[PDB]
């Protein structure tokens, strides 16, 4: 005997401050791979609709959430890594994809979760000015770990000889700039990419689109949704003091039991609504049909 | 018997390979053709 | 006959040393 | 000196409520009763004894625990980096007042990893002087300056009542700092007060940290006949370091919702027994735990 | 140098991983060098 939920409570964060996404893709100068930037987007609504309007991305892949669900979802911390690479390196930015040269510069965590974005920078980064200010490390005595950037530039002791300051045969300079060309072939155009690390750890969600905050209701099991927590149970205040940190709770069966609301700082107690079991006590149908 | 039942519950808190352990946090992340494989993992595990 | 259930003196010394929330979790998970 | 870790090394791995469950977590913890390194920065009270000053470089494994006995906010900050030179970045922290001003910029003061809190004559009292020991160019990437203004020294010679406990674990270009506060009583060692360490701050730093450092605040009253830094007889704070180990703890939450007790899974074979039985009630009989 | 000489547009293998290609060995190796269309570079794949 399963009681279906009545309505669909939704409770997303309060404000509707647009997230500064126009200065992520559409920006002037993108630092090279040997030193990329960290863009911490914090406590804002991010309407991905314009990120569906602004649709000029050549390659778009993510390994965590799906873009179908990116709209009706939330995140707690977001970080973006904007830079530029070769035309043949746009396929190298993928978790576990061992780069012939793309591990020295930028590696992706195999545990990644978030959508990477790439689009052709031929009209902005390939000009007559040579644009040799785009650089990338070519070799190093060790391969980097995913979210670490070796912005250092030292001499390389190739051939096992101390080439202290001098660049000679097998003493090369690692930070070799990009051999870009204004309006070169397809394989060699400068590609402008940007990743997004959606930290989906269960913490108070900040960066997500707006959805209709419906008023709380007690003792009525409803198809609620707290930042993706699509639970369908009754609601009540919880006696036990929740944590001043994250808004989510757990139990032995990893099915949330008590939460705290995004907007109001009131404690909630979740419980799947009345569940029992029918048992059709029947005499033989050859004798009746009443059960 | 009580301990058998008590160890049957704690199998709901097992990833079994999937990127979560609860079926509301797989359909709130992935899409049908891509969440179906995760749920296939979880369901063959829980059925086992 | 003192008890409502017609147990005995020695049956009572038994129904106390076994004793047979968690049951709510099991009830909710089916 | 060397001491034993009684009730230290536990931190909520991922903050969820976890009401009164015996969860078994696997992260970087600090084994119990291990060799924790005492560092008594006492003021040398004799003419013969050595000047006790503790700011030595400490190798940084994939984890490092911290604990600072305190009575008047003597010890302030920390410093990291691969080699602490122009080649590698070096994070830092400062605690000049209730405000928590920090940086990431590499400022080379290898000779002077100190800090100056000298007796100001103007309205004579315990006053702060030199919260700047930086002697290099920044060329840095991250920044954070928290400014809740409340300016405290409260110099004293009583028992070390306060102690702050820290965890600096970094993995995949992320820096995580857990922290909890507790009023201790004993002066000579770590009292038997159990608690776990809430997280406060996460900062992406993308640097291969391999070293560690500390910041101490050394200057005294001007009535001292001589150099207040070469001669100082009021500093007594001590700090403890424990290199975190890859463990598998079993955290016993309580009714209210905080980690009350825990047990290692390599400390004693009886602790491995409790780790296998999944409880703290191990009745008579032979158990088989591992190989 | 096969990591130095990095100008390859498409690079796929179905056995070992390039991460482990360095610290590994082989007993017999054979190479089949040729040229194809631009739209046939995706046709060189097992079962395709």
In DSSP terms, which residues pair with A136 in a beta bridge?
A176
- Listed residue (A136, A168, A143, A148) closest to A32, CA to CA: A136
Rg (CA), chain C: 15
Angstrom CA distances, D256 to A173, D17, D69, stand at: 60, 9, 28
Cβ atoms of residues D240 and D90 within 8 Å: no
Report chain E residues whose CB lies below 8 A from the CB of A101: 3-4, 6
Angstrom CA distances, D251 to A192, B27, D8, D195, D273, stand at: 46, 30, 13, 11, 15
- Report the neighbours of D using a cutoff of 3 or more CB pairs below 8 angstroms: A
Asked whether E and B share 3 or more beta-carbon pairs under 8 angstroms, the answer is no
| Experimental technique of record | cryo-EM
Q: Are strands D114-115 and D211-217 parallel, antiparallel or unpaired?
A: parallel
D129/D113 Cα distance (integer angstroms): 15
A24/A27 Cα distance (integer angstroms): 6
Is some CB atom of chain E closer than 8 A to the CB atom of A99?
yes
A190/A30 Cα distance (integer angstroms): 11
Tokens 């796929």 label which residue? E12
Report chain C residues whose CB lies below 8 A from the CB of B46: none
DSSP assignments along D174-189, one per residue: EEEEEEEEEE---SSS
Please tell me chain B's helix, strand, coil percentages from 3-state DSSP, rounded to the nearest 5. Answer: 50, 0, 50
DSSP assignments along D186-232, one per residue: -SSS--S-----EEEEEEE------EEEEEEE----TTSSS-TTTS-
> Per DSSP, which regions of D82-149 are E strands?
92-93, 101-103, 114-115, 143-145
Q: Which two tokens stand for residue D120?
A: 């100001």
Subunit contact B22:A73, Cβ cutoff 8 A: no
Resolution (A): 3.6
Q: Which two tokens stand for residue B13?
A: 């808190």
A194/A199 Cα distance (integer angstroms): 16
φ, ψ for residue A34 (rounded to 5)? Answer: -65, -15
φ, ψ for residue D35 (rounded to 5)? Answer: -80, 95
A114/A200 Cα distance (integer angstroms): 9
Q: Which CATH number fits domain D2-289: 2.60.120.960, 1.10.4080.10, 1.10.1580.10, 2.60.120.10?
A: 2.60.120.960
φ, ψ for residue B3 (rounded to 5)? Answer: -70, -30
Q: Are strands A232-236 and D198-204 parallel, antiparallel or unpaired?
A: unpaired
The three-state (H, E, C) secondary structure of chain A, written as one string = CECCCCCCCCCCCCCCCECCCHHHHCCCCCCCHHHCCCEEECCCECCCCHHHHCCCCCEEEECCCCHHHHCCCCCCEEEEEEEEECCCCCCCCCCCCCCCCHHHHCCCCCCCCCEEEEEECHHHHCCCCCCCCCEEECCCCCCCCCCCCCCCCCCCCCCCCCCCCCCCCCCCCCEEECCCCCCCCHHHCCEEEEEECCECCCCCCCCCCCCCCCCCCCCCCEECCECCECCEEEEECCCCCCCCCCCCCCCCCCCCCEEECCCCCCEEEEECCCECCCCCCCCCCCCCCCC
Q: Which two tokens stand for residue D208?
A: 């291969």
- Listed residue (D14, D38, D39, D29) closest to D62, CA to CA: D29
- Report the neighbours of C using a cutoff of 3 or more CB pairs below 8 angstroms: A, B
The SS3 of residue D250 is strand
A245/D254 Cα distance (integer angstroms): 17
**CA D223 and chain centroid, separation:** 32
Is some CB atom of chain A closer than 8 A to the CB atom of E4?
yes
φ, ψ for residue D46 (rounded to 5)? Answer: -110, 170
Q: Chain B closest CA to A103's CA: distance in Å?
A: 25
On the 0-12 / 13-18 / 19+ scale of CB atoms within 10 A, A167 is exposed
Q: Where exactly are the structural domains of chain D?
A: 2-289
Q: Chain A closest CA to D88's CA: distance in Å?
A: 6
On the 0-12 / 13-18 / 19+ scale of CB atoms within 10 A, D171 is middle
Q: Chain B closest CA to A214's CA: distance in Å?
A: 19
Q: What is the DSSP letter of E43?
A: T
D98/D162 Cα distance (integer angstroms): 15
Q: Chain A closest CA to E27's CA: distance in Å?
A: 23
D221/D121 Cα distance (integer angstroms): 9
């Amino acid at each position: 005997f399963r009681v279906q939920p009545t309505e669909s409570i939704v409770r997303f964060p309060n404000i509707t401050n647009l997230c500064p996404f126009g200065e992520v893709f559409n920006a002037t100068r993108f630092a090279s791979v040997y030193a990329w930037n960290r863009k911490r987007i914090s406590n804002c609504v991010a309407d991905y609709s314009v990120l569906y309007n602004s649709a000029s991305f050549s390659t778009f892949k993510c390994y965590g959430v799906s873009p179908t669900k990116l709209n009706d979802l939330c995140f707690t911390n977001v970080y973006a890594d904007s830079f530029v690479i070769r035309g043949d390196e746009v396929r190298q930015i993928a978790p576990g994809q061992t780069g012939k040269i793309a591990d020295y510069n930028y590696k992706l965590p195999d545990d990644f979760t978030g959508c990477v974005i790439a689009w052709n920078s031929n009209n902005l980064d390939s000009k007559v000015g040579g644009n040799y200010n785009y650089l990338y490390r070519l070799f190093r005595k060790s391969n980097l770990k995913p979210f670490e950037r070796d912005i250092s530039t030292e001499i390389y002791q190739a051939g096992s000889t101390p080439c202290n300051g001098v660049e000679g045969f097998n003493c090369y300079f690692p930070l070799q700039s990009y051999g870009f060309q204004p309006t070169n072939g397809v394989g060699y155009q400068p590609y402008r990419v940007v990743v997004l690390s959606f930290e989906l750890l269960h913490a108070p969600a900040t960066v997500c689109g707006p959805k209709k905050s419906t008023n709380l209701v007690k003792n009525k099991c409803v198809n609620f949704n707290f930042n993706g927590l699509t639970g369908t149970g009754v609601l009540t205040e919880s006696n036990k003091k929740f944590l001043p940190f994250q808004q989510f709770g757990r139990d032995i069966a990893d099915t949330t039991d008590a939460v705290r609301d995004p907007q109001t700082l009131e404690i909630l107690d979740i419980t799947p609504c009345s569940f029992g079991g029918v048992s059709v006590i029947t005499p033989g149908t050859n004798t009746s049909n009443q059960v | 018997n009580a301990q058998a039942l008590n160890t049957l519950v704690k199998q709901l808190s097992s990833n079994f390979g999937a990127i979560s352990s609860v079926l509301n946090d797989i359909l709130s992340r992935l899409d049908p053709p891509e969440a179906e494989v995760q749920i296939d993992r979880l369901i063959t595990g829980r059925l086992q | 006959p003192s008890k409502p259930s017609k147990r005995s003196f020695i049956e009572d010394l038994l129904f106390n040393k076994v004793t047979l929330d968690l049951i709510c979790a099991q009830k909710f998970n089916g | 000196a060397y001491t034993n870790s009684f009730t230290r090394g536990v931190y909520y791995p991922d903050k969820v409520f976890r009401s009164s469950v015996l969860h078994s977590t696997q992260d970087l913890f600090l084994p119990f009763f291990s060799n924790v390194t005492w560092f008594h920065a006492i003021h040398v009270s004799g003419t013969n004894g050595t000047k006790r000053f503790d700011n030595p470089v400490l190798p940084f494994n994939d984890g490092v625990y911290f604990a600072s006995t305190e009575k008047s906010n003597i010890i302030r900050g920390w410093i990291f980096g691969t080699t602490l030179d122009s080649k590698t970045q070096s994070l830092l922290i400062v605690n000049n007042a209730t405000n928590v001003v920090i940086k990431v910029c590499e400022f080379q003061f290898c000779n002077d990893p100190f800090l100056g809190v000298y007796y100001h004559k103007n309205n004579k009292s315990w006053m702060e002087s030199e919260f700047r020991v930086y002697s290099s160019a920044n060329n840095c990437t991250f920044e954070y300056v928290s400014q809740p203004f409340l300016m405290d020294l409260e110099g004293k010679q009583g028992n070390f009542k306060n102690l702050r406990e820290f965890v600096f674990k970094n993995i995949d270009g992320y820096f995580k700092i857990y922290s909890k506060h507790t009023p201790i009583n004993l002066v000579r060692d770590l009292p038997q007060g159990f608690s776990a360490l809430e997280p406060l701050v996460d900062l992406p730093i993308g640097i291969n940290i391999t070293r560690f450092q500390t910041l101490l605040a050394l200057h005294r009253s001007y009535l001292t006949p001589g150099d207040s830094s070469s001669g100082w007889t009021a500093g007594a704070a001590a700090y403890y370091v424990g290199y975190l180990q890859p463990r598998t703890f079993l955290l016993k939450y309580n009714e209210n919702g905080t980690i009350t007790d825990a047990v290692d899974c390599a400390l004693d074979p009886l602790s491995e027994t409790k780790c296998t039985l999944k409880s703290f009630t191990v009745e008579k009989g032979i158990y088989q735990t591992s190989n």
